[PDB]
Design a protein around this ligand. Sequence first.
Ligand SMILES: O=C(NCCNc1ccccc1)c1cc(=O)[nH]c2ccccc12
Ligand SMILES: O=C(NCCNc1ccccc1)c1cc(=O)[nH]c2ccccc12
Lengths: 304, 304
Amino acid sequence: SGFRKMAFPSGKVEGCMVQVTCGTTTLNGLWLDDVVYCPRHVICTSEDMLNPNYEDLLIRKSNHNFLVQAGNVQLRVIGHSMQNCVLKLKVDTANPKTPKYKFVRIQPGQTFSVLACYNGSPSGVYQCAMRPNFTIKGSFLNGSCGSVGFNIDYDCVSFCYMHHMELPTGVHAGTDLEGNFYGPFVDRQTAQAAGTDTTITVNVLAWLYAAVINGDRWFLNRFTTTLNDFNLVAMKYNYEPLTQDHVDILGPLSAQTGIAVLDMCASLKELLQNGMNGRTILGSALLEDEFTPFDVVRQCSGVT
Amino acid sequence: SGFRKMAFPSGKVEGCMVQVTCGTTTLNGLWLDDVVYCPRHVICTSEDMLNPNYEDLLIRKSNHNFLVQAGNVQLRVIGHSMQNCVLKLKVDTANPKTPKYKFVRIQPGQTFSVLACYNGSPSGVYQCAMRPNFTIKGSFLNGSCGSVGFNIDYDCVSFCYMHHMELPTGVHAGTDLEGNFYGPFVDRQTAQAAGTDTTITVNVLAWLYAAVINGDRWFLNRFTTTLNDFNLVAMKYNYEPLTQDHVDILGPLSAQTGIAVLDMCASLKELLQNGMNGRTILGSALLEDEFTPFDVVRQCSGVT
Ligand SMILES: O=C(NCCNc1ccccc1)c1cc(=O)[nH]c2ccccc12
Ligand SMILES: O=C(NCCNc1ccccc1)c1cc(=O)[nH]c2ccccc12
């Protein structure tokens, strides 16, 4: 029992982290097989970030300008290419620590672990959700660029995020491993609107099922609701509309606890309309939305 | 910017996890050098846990009864000994993945990362605080015993906790790596009182300094207090009394933000007496006490 914001074990990812330096800028790279992936903004100077012409800037760079170091080992760069907002540095050595991996583009509302790195060294791991507005509420300082997000299924690492920047609002933006930004963000030092965010409704319900499984039951009530009625409430409180697809994915947690999805929606409706009244749920005083139905089952069943 | 309940990268610890089986019971072991450490309750059956006579039970066991497997590799056990509540299985092979390590007994209020494991396989990592009452509010299921807590300073892993049991109250108890339980707990299936817990005051103040560094400033006020006045309030709200040692350790965060420790105590006093008024601090709706002053500086400075 107990419920924590648990991250995947970062071991398989630590073995891929490298440091990439170009000119005077240093950031993190991801070494998989004979390729090192890093944000293309490694080629910019402080002056360049106002409106960088990445194609022009990369043309001044040669393989020998990209310095790649894995711990105390220097990698020989035999090729470079830009794909969207990432650079792919071909190296002459396959990473001996390359785990089985995939590159995936996660959907908003999904979760993943971030291994925050500086100078190619891992400093910490934490679990995040990709916000509905395609930002992540990370924890990243100068030099954290190139740090990646991921999920692990048995022995396979699905890399889903690479960190590129922090917005003035203190939230984070980045790309999938093909260099495509999540959201409307551009790798330019300009004011960038992150859309209106919403609370991930299916994850809050999943977290309420985790609370029930763990014994925190006070929020359960004698009421039920309908998808239509519940979504009128969700709209008012800036929660994502609940769909039948969300109800279906909540099926296993519904079966585990014997609490029908719409009945759990009625507890959520009452918590939105009345607040927590100074009580807590799983040690939290607000409604948590960073656990998916899959994370809840995994944490409550023990998948390794 | 941003602030997360960040765990250490678990890589160095994943490389030490093994599975230990004795009879029909399986749990996790920690393989460091040529020794495997695991909870001594691995030798008990379901019937034995009422009041186990561990010395008598271990006498029926031979080296060949302890089955130790590291992934797909079987370790040969050449020796066994009980030290307090842990068993130490001497194996004929030094773990090639043994990092530089130490065994430390942490103090209450200190934090550490837990790598939750099942069948010798790591499932997740999360950051914990050792409660003032010597419990940990973990997330652990059947088979999680032998999972360890730790801190990492550059290349050195300081192992501080090994998981042994879950109390009826759903909180967790365990030992240091010499098998000494933290708190009054015994490895017996009996009702066990965990003392009155308290909020770790120095950690809440440290977390308030992290909030200020990150821009969450609304709780700052025009007031100051004294250690005596502040502790009258701390007593009323079951917070640990603040000492000059705590003030001293908060020195760096005081210097960073230019907010004197006693002035930050006055903000904490007002938050305890008036609540949060439906506002949040670092995404939390309650006062967080699982970040030490050291964790705050590390997360806000970027130590790898
Ligand atoms: O290193 C960072 N940025 C460099 C790329 N800077 C850029 C990239 C794209 C567009 C505009 C500017 C950085 C990352 C972060 O998440 N938090 C920070 C906190 C303080 C100082 C810097 C950081
Ligand atoms: O495996 C666990 N215990 C076995 C040792 N059981 C024992 C050990 C010492 C004293 C009395 C009994 C266990 C650990 C945990 O933290 N959460 C659980 C949740 C459900 C089922 C079991 C667990």
